[PDB]
Amino acid sequence: SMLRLQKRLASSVLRCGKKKVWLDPNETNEIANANSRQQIRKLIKDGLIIRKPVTVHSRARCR
Amino acid sequence: MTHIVREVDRPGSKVNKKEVVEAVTIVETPPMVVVGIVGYVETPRGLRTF
Amino acid sequence: IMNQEKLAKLQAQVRIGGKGTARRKKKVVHR
Amino acid sequence: MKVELCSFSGYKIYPGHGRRYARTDGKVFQFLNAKCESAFLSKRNPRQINWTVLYRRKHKKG
Amino acid sequence: QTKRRALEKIDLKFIDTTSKFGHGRFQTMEEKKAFMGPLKKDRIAKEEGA
Amino acid sequence: NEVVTREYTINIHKRIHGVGFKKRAPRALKEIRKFAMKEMGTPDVRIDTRLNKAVWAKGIRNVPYRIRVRLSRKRNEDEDSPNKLYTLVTYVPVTTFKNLQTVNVDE
RNA sequence: UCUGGGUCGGGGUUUCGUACGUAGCAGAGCAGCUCCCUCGCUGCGAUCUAUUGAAAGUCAGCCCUCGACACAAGGGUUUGU
RNA sequence: AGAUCUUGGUGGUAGUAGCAAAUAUUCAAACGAGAACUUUGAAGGCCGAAGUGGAGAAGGGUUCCAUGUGAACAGCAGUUGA
Numbered sequence: 160s161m162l163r164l165q166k167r168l169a170s171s172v173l174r175c176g177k178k179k180v181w182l183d184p185n186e187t188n189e190i191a192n193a194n195s196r197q198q199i200r201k202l203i204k205d206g207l208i209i210r211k212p213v214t215v216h217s218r219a220r221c222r
Numbered sequence: 223m224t225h226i227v228r229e230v231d232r233p234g235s236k237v238n239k240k241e242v243v244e245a246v247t248i249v250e251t252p253p254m255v256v257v258g259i260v261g262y263v264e265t266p267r268g269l270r271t272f
Numbered sequence: 273i274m275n276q277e278k279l280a281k282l283q284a285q286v287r288i289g290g291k292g293t294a295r296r297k298k299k300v301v302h303r
Numbered sequence: 304m305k306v307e308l309c310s311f312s313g314y315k316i317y318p319g320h321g322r323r324y325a326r327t328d329g330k331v332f333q334f335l336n337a338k339c340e341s342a343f344l345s346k347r348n349p350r351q352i353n354w355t356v357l358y359r360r361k362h363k364k365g
Numbered sequence: 366q367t368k369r370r371a372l373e374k375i376d377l378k379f380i381d382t383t384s385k386f387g388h389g390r391f392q393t394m395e396e397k398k399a400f401m402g403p404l405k406k407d408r409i410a411k412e413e414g415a
Numbered sequence: 416n417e418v419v420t421r422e423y424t425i426n427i428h429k430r431i432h433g434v435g436f437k438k439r440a441p442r443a444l445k446e447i448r449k450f451a452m453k454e455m456g457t458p459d460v461r462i463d464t465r466l467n468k469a470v471w472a473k474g475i476r477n478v479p480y481r482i483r484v485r486l487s488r489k490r491n492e493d494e495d496s497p498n499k500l501y502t503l504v505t506y507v508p509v510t511t512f513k514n515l516q517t518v519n520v521d522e
Numbered sequence: 523u524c525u526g527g528g529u530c531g532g533g534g535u536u537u538c539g540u541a542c543g544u545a546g547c548a549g550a551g552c553a554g555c556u557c558c559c560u561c562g563c564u565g566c567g568a569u570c571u572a573u574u575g576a577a578a579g580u581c582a583g584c585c586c587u588c589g590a591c592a593c594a595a596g597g598g599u600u601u602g603u
Numbered sequence: 604a605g606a607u608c609u610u611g612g613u614g615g616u617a618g619u620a621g622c623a624a625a626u627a628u629u630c631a632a633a634c635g636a637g638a639a640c641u642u643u644g645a646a647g648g649c650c651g652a653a654g655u656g657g658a659g660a661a662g663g664g665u666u667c668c669a670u671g672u673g674a675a676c677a678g679c680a681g682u683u684g685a
């Protein structure tokens with residue numbers, strides 16, 4: 160269905176922007192059950208929600 | 223189209239007995255094949271296919 | 273154990289994006 | 304059939320092709336195209352242009 | 366056809382046949398081969414097939 | 416046979432020539448889907464995302480001149496669909512496009 | 523059809539101008555290695571040289587293939603003195 | 604029958620003008636009767652810290668957050684929504 164709430168909660172729980180929020184496309188239904196931040200914590204612990212790394216902005220060219 | 227170089231034989235002109243360039247057109251003309259004949263009759267209204 | 277068939281299908285799960293993207297680390301379901 | 308010319312590039316210019324240039328000092332040049340002409344007007348040495356005949360014979364290419 | 370422009374003998378001397386797909390600068394294939402010499406394309410072609 | 420897959424190359428540069436800058440990348444895949452329909456004769460076409468990356472590899476307007484794809488017409492007995500067959504196209508990375516011919520490839 | 527049209531490929535033509543890589547006792551030079559050497563070796567170094575008139579593109583509204591590939595006697599609507 | 608009459612309704616115009624200020628979208632899957640517009644994932648872009656960011660004052664007053672619906676509204680769609 161729609162994961163608008165889950166993405167917002169995952170961004171709030173991980174204290175990162177919605178840009179870096181990543182979800183497992185295959186396990187859509189299990190994540191759709193997450194109606195609380197406590198359940199979000201389980202999904203992160205279960206790895207279904209993953210914080211994407213910071214996009215690379217290297218300063219080697221400047222150096 | 224293309225261009226050529228030829229000798230000019232126009233007396234009294236500045237290009238007489240000289241060399242000039244002239245653009246020419248190449249038109250392919252394979253031989254025709256005749257398949258029919260139509261004759262026309264001269265009516266007071268003009269021409270019509272007899 | 274990680275045999276040829278398991279390593280064949282592991283490449284699908286661990287890859288979540290193209291070149292330059294981070295690799296998937298875990299996938300566990302537990303009740 | 305006419306006089307057959309040579310250019311900045313050293314190439315052979317056929318009749319009806321290119322242009323002819325006459326400077327103030329009296330020297331007369333002919334160019335196969337604009338590219339050979341533009342290089343000449345930019346004051347560039349044809350011995351440093353790889354497709355110029357003068358460069359090829361300078362380095363004995365071929 | 367009365368005027369001297371008409372009824373005037375025409376003799377050809379040279380015809381442009383260069384590549385009109387751009388600034389053509391060779392009338393024939395052979396002169397292009399002669400002027401430019403053997404290229405990399407013909408060098409390998411005569412070397413692979415032997 | 417009705418399940419055979421094949422390898423093709425597409426002159427994207429030829430089929431994009433004349434299209435504006437901000438539409439070159441979308442037109443490439445529209446041509447690709449049309450190209451897939453023309454050969455495999457199946458209106459239902461699926462485009463692999465890796466190939467979609469390959470079209471978008473050099474941005475939106477400098478679309479690669481040629482691409483090498485692998486058409487796969489597969490039996491679509493998955494649900495109630497008017498087409499029994501669907502064409503899945505995949506991107507085949509190549510080092511060069513010289514002397515490449517359309518080859519019949521096994522499954 | 524004595525096949526046809528396509529899609530690639532090849533070739534021709536053309537545009538720009540000599541590709542990456544490799545090598546060079548070429549390189550303003552600079553830094554480490556000298557029982558070493560009797561003038562040397564190992565790194566950095568824009569550029570230059572042979573490869574290399576090379577590399578790339580070339581009909582989508584350029585040309586010729588007989589090389590490869592499948593496809594094409596299929597679909598629908600009408601038309602009578 | 605009028606009074607550029609008053610009120611209410613209905614035409615041609617006409618399926619016409621038009622839906623063009625601020626660069627840009629694409630592929631796959633999911634839900635669904637139905638997806639160019641929803642959700643996720645994968646790209647390519649944009650705002651480029653005097654922002655399309657992060658919080659307020661005035662003002663708005665429940666628009667806030669869930670769950671559900673697809674009657675009307677979001678000048679198209681909407682499985683979405685202030």
Ligand SMILES: [Mg+2]
Binds near residue numbers: 385386387
């Ligand atoms: Mg022309």
Ligand SMILES: [Mg+2]
């Ligand atoms: Mg070609």
Ligand SMILES: [Mg+2]
Binds near residue numbers: 604
């Ligand atoms: Mg009245």
Ligand SMILES: [Mg+2]
Binds near residue numbers: 605
């Ligand atoms: Mg009256």
Ligand SMILES: [Mg+2]
Binds near residue numbers: 607
């Ligand atoms: Mg009135």
Ligand SMILES: [Mg+2]
């Ligand atoms: Mg109008």
Ligand SMILES: [Mg+2]
């Ligand atoms: Mg209109």
Ligand SMILES: [Mg+2]
Binds near residue numbers: 622623
């Ligand atoms: Mg508009």
Ligand SMILES: [Mg+2]
Binds near residue numbers: 651
């Ligand atoms: Mg920017």
Ligand SMILES: [Mg+2]
Binds near residue numbers: 656657
């Ligand atoms: Mg702000």
Ligand SMILES: [Mg+2]
Binds near residue numbers: 674
């Ligand atoms: Mg309704």
Ligand SMILES: [Mg+2]
Binds near residue numbers: 679
């Ligand atoms: Mg509407």
Ligand SMILES: [Mg+2]
């Ligand atoms: Mg709300």
